[PDB]
RNA sequence: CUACCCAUGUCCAGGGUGAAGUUCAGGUAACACUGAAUGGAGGCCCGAACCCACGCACGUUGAAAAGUGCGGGGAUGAGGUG
RNA sequence: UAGGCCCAGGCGACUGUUUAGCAAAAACACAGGUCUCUGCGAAGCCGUAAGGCGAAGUAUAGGGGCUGACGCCUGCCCGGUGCUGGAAGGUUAAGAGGAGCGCUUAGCGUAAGCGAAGGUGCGAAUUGAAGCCCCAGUAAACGGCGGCCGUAACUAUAACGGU
RNA sequence: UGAUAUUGAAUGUUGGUACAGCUUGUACAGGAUAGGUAGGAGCCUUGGAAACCGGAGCGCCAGCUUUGGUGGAGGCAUCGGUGGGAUACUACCCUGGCUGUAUUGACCUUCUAACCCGCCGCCCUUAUCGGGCGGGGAGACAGUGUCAGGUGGGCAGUUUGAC
């Protein structure tokens, strides 16, 4: 039922600019989901069905190579 | 093959290695294809990309 | 010449065995099946032409710079041959 | 003119192919099994390139490696090498970048030397890819399946305990 | 696998290259923590000034002739400046800084004219070759040239002592 909505991608910083398209460039990749928009990035997340967790727990790996990991 | 308006061509030398024992080998001209007038006809042939620098329309 | 491939032709006397299927019956719950008839499959069987080359003997300045004689194998095919 | 037969084992499942001219087989092939690569201008291959085969095919297809009908099965090891994958770091070429130092001479000269501009050599720092060093997986991938002491027959079956 | 030419435009983020600006000179010292050489006394008063703190300046923030604010209506030069200056102004210049400028590079996008299309329609023409005009797809990548580094029995030329 939607285990990740679009007001999450939103709040990750992923609209736009220049910095969000680094997150989406960085993050796709680290799903193994390749490239998308917001919409076909949220469309992506919904039809290969990754878990929440996972989502997260990549979502702060890259936010910690962003901050040096 | 070779470049239609300065004729270059590709020819041939040796090749050494640190201990000199040479061997054969050969020098590639930069060439290139573009579409360009040619005696009032349009037409795509070889040229160097040297020509190229100045002095050439396309 | 020999190896493999491509296109187009052609050759294989004669006799066996009897798959599938079908039709009958019995049979079973109909089926499972059993038994007859029909049918004619198969890198199936026996064996000439043809192709090959397993044994022995002879030959070894030979009839022959690889054969002959008596036996041997495949022989409708992954066939032989122009 | 016209099949000798039988009883035991080894090898290979079978029909087939092979060293023309000393080897016809247990060797090769095969139907089946398994591993691996390949999203289409596919992978592979021939050719320097055009041009082709693959294929006027499309993952139930195509190439490569090993094994070799059918029945019961295929145990343990990822340290080494190979292959696949990943990041913190170290090491590394060409090319950029040019600090600074030589030689030469206008000048000052005073006797020794100092020496402005220009030219011509030599080049510091900084930067600079894969790969390698490193980590993880993988064995019908290359490969491996121990010594000592004390303890059980049959050709000492040393099975069994301690290092 | 990198650099470089073919090789374009617009961004954005971005490091710097100089311009433009006002700036703390903390010394344990002058009322007082008032730079560098400095001419030096002449200036300022309705620049609510001088007592003044922080907001240009440093900061365990002390105060500065510059400075938005009540802190209100003159000091400095001239006054032990422990002073390594005694400052009207500052003829010239520096650390506190960012902006617009000239940038240049490196990244991150976007676009379209280059280049590419074993895609489609029409023509040359009766032609799955070719190229010509339209559409479409990709796109400054790829392909190709020069240079450099890895790997490389796939393939070459050779060595492997004497008694
Ligand atoms: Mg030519
Ligand atoms: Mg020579
Ligand atoms: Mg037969
Ligand atoms: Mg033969
Ligand atoms: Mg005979
Ligand atoms: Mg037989
Ligand atoms: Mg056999
Ligand atoms: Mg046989
Ligand atoms: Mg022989
Ligand atoms: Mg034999
Ligand atoms: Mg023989
Ligand atoms: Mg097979
Ligand atoms: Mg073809
Ligand atoms: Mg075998
Ligand atoms: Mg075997
Ligand atoms: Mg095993
Ligand atoms: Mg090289
Ligand atoms: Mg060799
Ligand atoms: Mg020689
Ligand atoms: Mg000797």
């Not at chain 2, 041939?12 to 080998?25: I, L, P, Q």
Request: some cysteine; proline content about 1%.
């Amino acid at each position: 039922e939607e285990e990740i909505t679009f007001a999450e991608l939103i709040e990750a910083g992923l609209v736009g600019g220049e910095m969000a398209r680094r997150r989406r460039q960085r993050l796709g990749e680290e799903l193994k989901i390749g490239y998308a928009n917001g919409r076909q990035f949220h469309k992506r997340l919904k039809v290969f069905r990754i878990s929440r967790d996972a989502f997260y727990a990549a979502l702060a790996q890259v936010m910690r190579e962003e901050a040096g990991d | 093959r070779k470049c239609v308006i300065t004729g270059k061509k590709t020819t041939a030398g040796n090749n050494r290695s640190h201990a000199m024992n040479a061997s054969k080998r050969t020098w590639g001209a930069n060439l290139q294809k573009v579409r360009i007038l040619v005696n009032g006809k349009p037409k795509k042939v070889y040229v160097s990309a040297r020509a190229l620098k100045s002095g050439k329309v396309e």
